[PDB]
């Protein structure tokens, strides 16, 4: 399953941009992983 994970990661992006760049980069990498699969 990639759909709910994409949804959720999308929402903690749009909820907390104030996270340090580390979390943003890691989470974007996670979304790139899910759409790659």
């Amino acid at each position: 399953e990639f759909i709910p994970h994409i949804f959720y990661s999308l929402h903690q992006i749009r909820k907390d941009p104030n996270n340090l760049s580390n979390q943003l980069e890691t989470l974007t990498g996670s979304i790139r992983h899910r759409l790659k699969l």
């Binding site: 974007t28 979304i31 790139r32 759409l35």
Partner: peptide
């Protein structure tokens, strides 16, 4: 060879395509 032509004919293929493009722009 006609398989990919049939696949490109249905809209949701284009949908996944520009969804990938939009995430590429976002990243």
């Amino acid at each position: 060879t006609n398989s990919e032509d049939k696949l490109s004919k249905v809209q949701l293929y284009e949908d996944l395509c520009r969804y990938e493009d939009t995430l590429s722009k976002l990243v």
